[PDB]
Amino acid sequence: MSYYHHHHHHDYDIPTTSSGELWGIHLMPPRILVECLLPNGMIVTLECLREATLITIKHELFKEARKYPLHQLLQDESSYIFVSVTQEAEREEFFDETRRLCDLRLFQPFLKVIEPVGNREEKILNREIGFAIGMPVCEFDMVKDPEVQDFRRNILNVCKEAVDLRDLNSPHSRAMYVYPPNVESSPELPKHIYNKLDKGQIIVVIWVIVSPNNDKQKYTLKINHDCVPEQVIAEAIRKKTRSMLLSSEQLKLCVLEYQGKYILKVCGCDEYFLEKYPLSQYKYIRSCIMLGRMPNLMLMAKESLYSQLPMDCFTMPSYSNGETSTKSLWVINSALRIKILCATYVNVNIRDIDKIYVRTGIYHGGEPLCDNVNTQRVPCSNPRWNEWLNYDIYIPDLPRAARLCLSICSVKEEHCPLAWGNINLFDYTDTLVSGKMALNLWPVPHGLEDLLNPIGVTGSNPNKETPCLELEFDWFSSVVKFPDMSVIEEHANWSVSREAGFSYSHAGLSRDNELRENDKEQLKAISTRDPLSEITEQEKDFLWSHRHYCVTIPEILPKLLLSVKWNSRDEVAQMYCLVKDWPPIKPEQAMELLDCNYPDPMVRGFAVRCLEKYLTDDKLSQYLIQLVQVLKYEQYLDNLLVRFLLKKALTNQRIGHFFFWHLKSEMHNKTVSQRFGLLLESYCRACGMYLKHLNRQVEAMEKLINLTDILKQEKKDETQKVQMKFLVEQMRRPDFMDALQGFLSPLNPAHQLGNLRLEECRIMSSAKRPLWLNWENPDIMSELLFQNNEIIFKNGDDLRQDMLTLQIIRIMENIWQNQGLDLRMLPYGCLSIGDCVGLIEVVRNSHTIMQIQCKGGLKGALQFNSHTLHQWLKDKNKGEIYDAAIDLFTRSCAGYCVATFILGIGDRHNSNIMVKDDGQLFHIDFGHFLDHKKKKFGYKRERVPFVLTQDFLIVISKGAQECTKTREFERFQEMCYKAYLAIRQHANLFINLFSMMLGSGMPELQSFDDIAYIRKTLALDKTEQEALEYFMKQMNDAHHGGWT
Amino acid sequence: SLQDAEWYWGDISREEVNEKLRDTADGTFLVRDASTKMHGDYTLTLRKGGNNKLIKIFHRDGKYGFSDPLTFSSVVELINHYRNESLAQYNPKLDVKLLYPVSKYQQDQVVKEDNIEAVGKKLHEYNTQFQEKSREYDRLYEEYTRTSQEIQMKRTAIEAFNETIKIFEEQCQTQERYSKEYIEKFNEKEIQRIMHNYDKLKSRISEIIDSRRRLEEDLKKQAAEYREIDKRMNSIKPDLIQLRKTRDQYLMWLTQKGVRQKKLNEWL
């Protein structure tokens, strides 16, 4: 289970038994000339080895200087530090003189000798943060923008708080941060698991070490699955210390003195059992059960653990009314106008294109007025309109999250967007935007053929050389602010009393009230619909009018909120009080409220208050991706959600590890860099010792990126044999050995990697040249888990579609399992760490169906034998091991069939399907995911990506002829029908997870109907009975029979 | 009349509505079947710039209506009226008409080639061109992205070049201080070899400037082609739309006369 490569032990029964290393080049030459600029004005040039340490270079320099004129004007070598300009154009003092030349990221091969001012050395080891982020801190210090500089100052609250929580019951609190418990969501053990246990008991194996010790000692135990680590410790010490010389009382006393000097560790990885949970709840224990394994734990002295924890010791960083009461928005007596001035940088053929105009609209998620363009004036050849555009919306009815979305267009109906840009009508301080603005625009994305793009990010594109469009917002001779909460609350109380006195009735008849109309439990109906099933105007009016009854059905809220007329402050002010104390709702549902359809701050604040209550560290690291992504739709840098995620990250180092990488991953994406670097900076400043660990992971990956870059350009048209020598030569160099040798795997930080096994390292056959790497597991019980650790580093593929799909698979597995139906997916580990750069978990003992077929299959090549997979499997599992191998295969295959059909991944054939020796089947290399390759045609495809060819059908009905017709196949068809139905009762969760991914620049997810595949595939508009038939129909047609 | 109705597509589910209402404007409209009869009867869908507005048509006592204005003795009855008038009188914030009946059965173009088989051959021609176009577009979209990053690397290099030049100018300044502080002594041996250092230093500051310049000259060269890609991108984009939109109509006029849902994928 990343623990055991998901290897099942079928016998085991419990009831028995270009700009890389220097500007221009990738790899500095092994010998290099360096200019040393001396503080005496001389330049001596050293011939250095590429891997020389600054300690060595300095020493050589001050020996050579003696030979040039002006020597005695020099101090002792010790009185000095190197500085140089680095590849990000910043002069950097080199404090850590144990760094190697090839690792400073120079630009020019030259070093300047200086004596160190900025005298706070400590503070300037602050390049560490910038290294981990991939941009120097001083870039932030320079950013004029008040929002930015307010975020840096204001976020520190969160930092100081978290640092407090850690140092609470220190050291235990610290241990609990660095090594949080790995734990299932519920203690209630699913029926299928309980049952591998013989009426609730596991054999476990507690190991121990005294002197030296090259001797370790088993103490096999048999305890209830639900008995805590403390109990388990007692029982080992009890076993270990019984003796003929100790009485019974005396034994009990010795157990008391020892019980709590110890804690439990998983042998082989860096996972501990530091809190009270049933043993069964720890994910290792549960994995061992599923896999037919005996748990191996270790008894660790608390001190020798506290020993490996160092003080984190956080430091506050160096960077430590209005217009006399201001004027309220609700007073401005006018409609809205915006003046469009000019564009500068439009690129168009006067020949191909007739004309250009600016298309504009006011939006809150979707729009609050008549959309409107300016005349087609002086088109192409120097674009100038000088128009006030006139929107029909009064200024007081602008909601807090109002946006302007503009786009420059071409024109019988040539309607085509050239560039697009969006602005928040209010700023981070609630100030209505006034005066002049320059907006740099964004390029029309792959997918979007629409005219306007309000999903896109708010703010100016930070590429200077883009269509810049100048703008002019009105002026009301004062800075205008959005009203106080208390002001809005009175306006709502007023509106309410005011309704209570009418008598005529129109559409939104806000009028029975006093009783319910009873059949008017359309409300409980509307409530259950998934988020993608559009609501009709009658229903919108309806939910509004029964807004107060909706409090009875808390989870109706998403739909209520879309029934509000956000261009009506009367309505919005009321919604505000309603939200103020709506019952909080399950997080699987709050999370919709954080997508791009719900930008109001009060609504999102609610969502976060839900999460704060209900979301557990287990379920949070499950959704961490969607949570990070959703930060893009937050309007401003300082928002309640960032505070929440940040405070968890600094409070739980497993969450923080993945928070760091997900952010770091997207640092190239300019639509998010500034936001994410800032966030990363807080984190790094406060995460504590982990920074040092991150810096190491980061040092590794840059080495891997730089190395594969050389292979991919400049070492092709070379044979693999040539490439491989180059590879190995390079990893032998000291800088690489050092960089790539003792660090935590970014795929799972509980896995130490150190000591590369170069003989087990290769370039896989793929044209992208992925690196197959293999590391010694340095743990003192490697043996007991896995001696070698292997992961793949791939440079060239965008890993985040795969990443998402695997996450979906993991979530499907859980839904099925925890409902007691046992389908076995293998969501292997995938992590994007860059622009098209990533790590894929390796799974030992798995083979492409194609290989299986290639190994077994006779002399003369003609046709491939359908039975061979089955043969291959029989050979791997003789006996009654067989019957369970066929069961695993039946089950995984059933799972990977339903998930595949629902998600509509790429076509499955003999080399994206994989089998394990225990007979577990799993997919790899998903291609696109919502039938994206229907960007052409598609139109009601709903393809079956996983067709069971004879090969598979044979295996399922142990070896029958005419498998279509057996009991096993009925058994299978039943798991299929049951799993499809299970995932369908959780459709909302799945849609919401895709919604929150519209952010990410993922060509497969650009608009809510990219996502609408899922409704078809899960027959959401039908009754479940009909859906069952739909599903059978679908399977019937792809297989041509079988399913009726 | 009722099955024809021109704007009535019946059994299309929520999706192929928005997908047939994608990228028109103002007041466009069309009628649907409701999803459950434990829901409603028919759905009028509007368009209001990117936003799709859904209106329920209820059918009870022979009467068809949105709400209580039930007098409207047909489905086909109720629509006509609102193609002439606004929906605002039913519910306030609905100040649009059904002016754009866009549902025209796509016999307007499609060369009217009654063939079906010939109409399908066109479908393939256009669909290849489309894909050819989508790839050119895609190739260009990527060249653009690379070129953006390559420009910005060139910008920071230019900066790093300047920074370097400062450190070196500073350097032959620094020295003049301590250098011409020793030139005072009689010893012109040492002076000569202090001149050598000084003269390595300046022709180096020459070389470096020669190298920044050389790179600024390539930033323009790049900024040029960058402009070019944008030009050509905006020139494909409108073509990729009408090619794409004519491929939707040929696919309609086909599945108008005779579904054959499965046969189509040969021409795609």
CSV table of N, CA, C and O in Angstrom, one decimal, chain A residues 403-475:
chain,number,residue,atom,x,y,z
A,403,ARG,N,-18.1,42.5,-10.7
A,403,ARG,CA,-16.9,42.6,-11.5
A,403,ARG,C,-17.3,43.2,-12.9
A,403,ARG,O,-18.4,43.2,-13.3
A,404,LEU,N,-16.3,43.8,-13.5
A,404,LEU,CA,-16.4,44.2,-14.9
A,404,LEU,C,-15.6,43.2,-15.7
A,404,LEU,O,-14.4,42.9,-15.4
A,405,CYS,N,-16.2,42.7,-16.8
A,405,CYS,CA,-15.5,41.8,-17.7
A,405,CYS,C,-15.6,42.4,-19.1
A,405,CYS,O,-16.6,42.6,-19.6
A,406,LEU,N,-14.4,42.7,-19.6
A,406,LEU,CA,-14.3,43.3,-20.9
A,406,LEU,C,-13.5,42.4,-21.8
A,406,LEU,O,-12.7,41.5,-21.3
A,407,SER,N,-13.7,42.6,-23.1
A,407,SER,CA,-12.9,41.8,-24.1
A,407,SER,C,-12.9,42.7,-25.4
A,407,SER,O,-13.9,43.3,-25.7
A,408,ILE,N,-11.8,42.6,-26.1
A,408,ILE,CA,-11.7,43.3,-27.4
A,408,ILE,C,-12.1,42.3,-28.6
A,408,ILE,O,-11.7,41.1,-28.6
A,409,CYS,N,-13.0,42.7,-29.5
A,409,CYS,CA,-13.6,41.7,-30.4
A,409,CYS,C,-13.4,42.1,-31.9
A,409,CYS,O,-13.1,43.2,-32.2
A,410,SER,N,-13.6,41.1,-32.8
A,410,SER,CA,-13.6,41.3,-34.2
A,410,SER,C,-15.0,41.1,-34.8
A,410,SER,O,-15.7,40.2,-34.3
A,411,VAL,N,-15.2,41.8,-35.9
A,411,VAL,CA,-16.4,41.6,-36.7
A,411,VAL,C,-16.0,41.8,-38.2
A,411,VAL,O,-14.9,42.1,-38.5
A,412,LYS,N,-20.8,38.2,-42.0
A,412,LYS,CA,-21.9,38.9,-41.3
A,412,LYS,C,-21.8,38.9,-39.8
A,412,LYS,O,-22.0,39.9,-39.1
A,413,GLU,N,-21.6,37.7,-39.2
A,413,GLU,CA,-21.4,37.5,-37.8
A,413,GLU,C,-20.0,36.9,-37.5
A,413,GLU,O,-19.9,35.7,-37.2
A,414,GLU,N,-19.0,37.8,-37.6
A,414,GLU,CA,-17.6,37.4,-37.3
A,414,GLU,C,-17.2,37.4,-35.8
A,414,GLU,O,-16.1,37.1,-35.5
A,415,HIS,N,-18.2,37.6,-35.0
A,415,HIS,CA,-18.0,37.8,-33.6
A,415,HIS,C,-16.9,36.9,-33.0
A,415,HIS,O,-17.2,35.7,-32.8
A,416,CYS,N,-15.8,37.5,-32.8
A,416,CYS,CA,-14.6,36.8,-32.3
A,416,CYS,C,-13.7,37.5,-31.3
A,416,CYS,O,-13.2,38.6,-31.6
A,417,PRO,N,-13.4,36.9,-30.1
A,417,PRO,CA,-12.6,37.6,-29.1
A,417,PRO,C,-11.1,37.6,-29.4
A,417,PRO,O,-10.6,36.6,-29.7
A,418,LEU,N,-10.5,38.8,-29.3
A,418,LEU,CA,-9.0,38.9,-29.5
A,418,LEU,C,-8.3,38.7,-28.2
A,418,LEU,O,-7.3,37.9,-28.1
A,419,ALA,N,-8.7,39.4,-27.2
A,419,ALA,CA,-8.1,39.4,-25.8
A,419,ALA,C,-9.3,39.7,-24.8
A,419,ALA,O,-10.3,40.3,-25.1
A,420,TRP,N,-9.0,39.4,-23.5
A,420,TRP,CA,-10.0,39.5,-22.4
A,420,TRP,C,-9.4,39.9,-21.1
A,420,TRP,O,-8.3,39.6,-20.8
A,421,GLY,N,-10.2,40.6,-20.2
A,421,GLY,CA,-9.7,41.1,-18.9
A,421,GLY,C,-10.8,41.4,-18.0
A,421,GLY,O,-11.9,41.9,-18.4
A,422,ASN,N,-10.7,41.1,-16.7
A,422,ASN,CA,-11.7,41.4,-15.7
A,422,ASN,C,-11.2,42.3,-14.5
A,422,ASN,O,-10.1,42.1,-14.0
A,423,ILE,N,-12.0,43.2,-14.0
A,423,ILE,CA,-11.7,44.0,-12.9
A,423,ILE,C,-12.7,43.9,-11.7
A,423,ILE,O,-13.9,44.0,-12.0
A,424,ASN,N,-12.3,43.7,-10.5
A,424,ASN,CA,-13.2,43.9,-9.4
A,424,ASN,C,-13.6,45.4,-9.2
A,424,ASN,O,-12.8,46.3,-8.9
A,425,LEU,N,-14.9,45.6,-9.2
A,425,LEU,CA,-15.4,47.0,-9.0
A,425,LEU,C,-15.2,47.5,-7.6
A,425,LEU,O,-15.3,48.7,-7.4
A,426,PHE,N,-14.8,46.7,-6.6
A,426,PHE,CA,-14.4,47.1,-5.3
A,426,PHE,C,-13.1,46.6,-5.0
A,426,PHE,O,-12.7,45.6,-5.6
A,427,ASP,N,-12.3,47.2,-4.1
A,427,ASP,CA,-11.0,46.7,-3.8
A,427,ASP,C,-10.9,46.1,-2.4
A,427,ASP,O,-11.9,46.0,-1.7
A,428,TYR,N,-9.7,45.6,-2.0
A,428,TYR,CA,-9.6,44.9,-0.8
A,428,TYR,C,-10.0,45.6,0.4
A,428,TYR,O,-10.0,45.0,1.5
A,429,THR,N,-10.4,46.9,0.3
A,429,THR,CA,-10.7,47.7,1.5
A,429,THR,C,-12.2,48.1,1.4
A,429,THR,O,-12.6,49.0,2.2
A,430,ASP,N,-12.9,47.5,0.5
A,430,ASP,CA,-14.3,47.8,0.2
A,430,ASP,C,-14.5,49.1,-0.6
A,430,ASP,O,-15.6,49.6,-0.7
A,431,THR,N,-13.4,49.7,-1.1
A,431,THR,CA,-13.5,51.0,-1.9
A,431,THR,C,-14.0,50.8,-3.3
A,431,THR,O,-13.3,50.2,-4.1
A,432,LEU,N,-15.1,51.5,-3.6
A,432,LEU,CA,-15.6,51.5,-5.0
A,432,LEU,C,-14.5,52.1,-5.9
A,432,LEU,O,-13.9,53.1,-5.6
A,433,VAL,N,-14.2,51.4,-7.0
A,433,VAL,CA,-13.1,51.8,-7.8
A,433,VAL,C,-13.4,53.1,-8.6
A,433,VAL,O,-14.5,53.2,-9.2
A,434,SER,N,-12.5,54.1,-8.6
A,434,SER,CA,-12.7,55.4,-9.3
A,434,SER,C,-11.5,55.8,-10.0
A,434,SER,O,-10.3,55.5,-9.7
A,435,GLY,N,-11.7,56.6,-11.1
A,435,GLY,CA,-10.5,57.2,-11.8
A,435,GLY,C,-10.1,56.4,-13.0
A,435,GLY,O,-10.8,55.9,-13.8
A,436,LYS,N,-8.7,56.3,-13.2
A,436,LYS,CA,-8.2,55.7,-14.4
A,436,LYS,C,-7.5,54.4,-14.1
A,436,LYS,O,-6.9,54.2,-13.0
A,437,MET,N,-7.5,53.5,-15.1
A,437,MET,CA,-7.0,52.2,-15.0
A,437,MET,C,-6.4,51.7,-16.3
A,437,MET,O,-7.0,52.0,-17.4
A,438,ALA,N,-5.3,51.1,-16.2
A,438,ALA,CA,-4.7,50.4,-17.3
A,438,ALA,C,-4.8,48.9,-17.1
A,438,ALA,O,-4.4,48.4,-16.1
A,439,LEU,N,-5.5,48.2,-18.0
A,439,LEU,CA,-5.7,46.8,-17.9
A,439,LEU,C,-5.0,46.1,-19.0
A,439,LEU,O,-5.4,46.3,-20.2
A,440,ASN,N,-3.9,45.4,-18.6
A,440,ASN,CA,-3.3,44.4,-19.6
A,440,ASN,C,-4.1,43.2,-19.8
A,440,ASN,O,-4.4,42.5,-18.9
A,441,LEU,N,-4.4,42.8,-21.0
A,441,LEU,CA,-5.3,41.7,-21.3
A,441,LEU,C,-4.7,40.3,-21.4
A,441,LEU,O,-3.5,40.1,-21.5
A,442,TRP,N,-5.6,39.3,-21.4
A,442,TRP,CA,-5.3,37.9,-21.4
A,442,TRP,C,-5.6,37.3,-22.7
A,442,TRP,O,-6.5,37.7,-23.4
A,443,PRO,N,-4.8,36.2,-23.1
A,443,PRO,CA,-5.1,35.7,-24.4
A,443,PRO,C,-6.2,34.6,-24.4
A,443,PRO,O,-6.3,33.7,-23.5
A,444,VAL,N,-7.2,34.8,-25.3
A,444,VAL,CA,-8.3,33.8,-25.4
A,444,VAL,C,-7.9,32.4,-25.4
A,444,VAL,O,-7.2,31.9,-26.3
A,445,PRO,N,-8.2,31.7,-24.3
A,445,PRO,CA,-7.8,30.3,-24.0
A,445,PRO,C,-8.3,29.3,-25.1
A,445,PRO,O,-9.4,29.5,-25.7
A,446,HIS,N,-7.6,28.2,-25.2
A,446,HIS,CA,-7.9,27.0,-26.0
A,446,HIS,C,-9.4,26.8,-26.2
A,446,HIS,O,-9.9,27.1,-27.3
A,447,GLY,N,-10.1,26.4,-25.2
A,447,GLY,CA,-11.5,26.1,-25.2
A,447,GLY,C,-12.4,27.2,-25.6
A,447,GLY,O,-12.9,27.2,-26.7
A,448,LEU,N,-12.6,28.2,-24.7
A,448,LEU,CA,-13.5,29.3,-24.8
A,448,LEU,C,-13.7,29.9,-26.2
A,448,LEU,O,-12.7,30.5,-26.7
A,449,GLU,N,-14.9,29.7,-26.8
A,449,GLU,CA,-15.2,30.4,-28.0
A,449,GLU,C,-16.3,31.4,-27.7
A,449,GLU,O,-16.7,32.2,-28.6
A,450,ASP,N,-16.7,31.5,-26.5
A,450,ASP,CA,-17.6,32.6,-26.0
A,450,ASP,C,-17.1,34.0,-26.3
A,450,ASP,O,-15.9,34.1,-26.8
A,451,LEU,N,-17.8,35.0,-26.0
A,451,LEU,CA,-17.3,36.4,-26.2
A,451,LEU,C,-16.6,37.1,-25.0
A,451,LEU,O,-16.1,38.2,-25.2
A,452,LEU,N,-16.6,36.6,-23.8
A,452,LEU,CA,-16.3,37.4,-22.6
A,452,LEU,C,-15.6,36.9,-21.4
A,452,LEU,O,-15.0,37.6,-20.7
A,453,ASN,N,-15.7,35.6,-21.2
A,453,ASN,CA,-14.9,35.0,-20.1
A,453,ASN,C,-14.9,35.5,-18.6
A,453,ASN,O,-13.9,35.9,-18.1
A,454,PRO,N,-16.1,35.5,-18.0
A,454,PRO,CA,-16.1,35.9,-16.5
A,454,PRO,C,-15.6,34.9,-15.5
A,454,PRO,O,-15.6,35.1,-14.3
A,455,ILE,N,-15.2,33.7,-16.0
A,455,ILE,CA,-14.6,32.8,-15.0
A,455,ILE,C,-13.2,33.2,-14.8
A,455,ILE,O,-12.6,33.1,-13.7
A,456,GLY,N,-12.5,33.8,-15.8
A,456,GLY,CA,-11.1,34.1,-15.8
A,456,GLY,C,-10.7,35.0,-14.6
A,456,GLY,O,-11.5,35.6,-14.0
A,457,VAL,N,-9.4,35.0,-14.3
A,457,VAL,CA,-9.0,35.8,-13.2
A,457,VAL,C,-9.2,37.2,-13.3
A,457,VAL,O,-9.2,37.8,-14.4
A,458,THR,N,-9.4,37.8,-12.1
A,458,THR,CA,-9.5,39.2,-12.0
A,458,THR,C,-8.2,39.8,-11.8
A,458,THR,O,-7.5,39.5,-10.8
A,459,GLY,N,-7.8,40.8,-12.6
A,459,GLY,CA,-6.6,41.6,-12.5
A,459,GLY,C,-5.9,41.8,-13.8
A,459,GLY,O,-6.2,41.1,-14.7
A,460,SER,N,-4.9,42.7,-13.8
A,460,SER,CA,-4.1,42.8,-15.0
A,460,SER,C,-3.1,41.7,-15.2
A,460,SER,O,-2.3,41.5,-14.3
A,461,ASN,N,-3.1,41.1,-16.4
A,461,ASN,CA,-2.1,40.3,-16.9
A,461,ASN,C,-0.7,40.9,-16.7
A,461,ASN,O,-0.4,42.0,-17.2
A,462,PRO,N,0.2,40.2,-16.0
A,462,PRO,CA,1.5,40.8,-15.7
A,462,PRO,C,2.6,40.7,-16.9
A,462,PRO,O,3.7,40.9,-16.6
A,463,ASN,N,2.1,40.4,-18.1
A,463,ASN,CA,3.0,40.6,-19.2
A,463,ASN,C,2.9,42.0,-19.8
A,463,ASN,O,1.8,42.4,-20.3
A,464,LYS,N,3.9,42.8,-19.6
A,464,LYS,CA,4.0,44.2,-20.2
A,464,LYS,C,3.5,44.2,-21.7
A,464,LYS,O,2.6,44.9,-22.0
A,465,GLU,N,4.2,43.5,-22.5
A,465,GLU,CA,3.9,43.4,-24.0
A,465,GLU,C,2.6,42.6,-24.3
A,465,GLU,O,2.6,41.6,-24.9
A,466,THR,N,1.5,43.2,-23.9
A,466,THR,CA,0.1,42.7,-24.2
A,466,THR,C,-0.8,43.8,-24.6
A,466,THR,O,-0.5,45.0,-24.4
A,467,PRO,N,-2.0,43.5,-25.2
A,467,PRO,CA,-3.0,44.5,-25.3
A,467,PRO,C,-3.3,45.1,-24.0
A,467,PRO,O,-3.8,44.5,-23.1
A,468,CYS,N,-2.8,46.4,-23.8
A,468,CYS,CA,-3.2,47.2,-22.7
A,468,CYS,C,-4.4,48.1,-23.1
A,468,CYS,O,-4.4,48.7,-24.2
A,469,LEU,N,-5.4,48.1,-22.2
A,469,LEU,CA,-6.6,48.9,-22.5
A,469,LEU,C,-6.9,49.8,-21.4
A,469,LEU,O,-7.0,49.4,-20.3
A,470,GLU,N,-6.9,51.1,-21.7
A,470,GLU,CA,-7.1,52.1,-20.7
A,470,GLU,C,-8.5,52.5,-20.4
A,470,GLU,O,-9.3,52.5,-21.3
A,471,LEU,N,-8.8,52.8,-19.1
A,471,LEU,CA,-10.2,52.8,-18.7
A,471,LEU,C,-10.4,54.0,-17.7
A,471,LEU,O,-9.5,54.4,-17.1
A,472,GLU,N,-11.7,54.5,-17.7
A,472,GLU,CA,-12.0,55.5,-16.7
A,472,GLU,C,-13.3,55.3,-16.0
A,472,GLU,O,-14.4,55.4,-16.6
A,473,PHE,N,-13.2,55.0,-14.7
A,473,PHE,CA,-14.3,54.9,-13.8
A,473,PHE,C,-14.7,56.2,-13.2
A,473,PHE,O,-13.8,57.0,-12.9
A,474,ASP,N,-16.0,56.5,-13.1
A,474,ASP,CA,-16.5,57.7,-12.5
A,474,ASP,C,-15.8,58.2,-11.2
A,474,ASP,O,-15.0,57.5,-10.6
A,475,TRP,N,-16.3,59.4,-10.8
A,475,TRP,CA,-15.7,60.1,-9.7
A,475,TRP,C,-16.9,60.7,-9.0
A,475,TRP,O,-17.7,61.5,-9.6
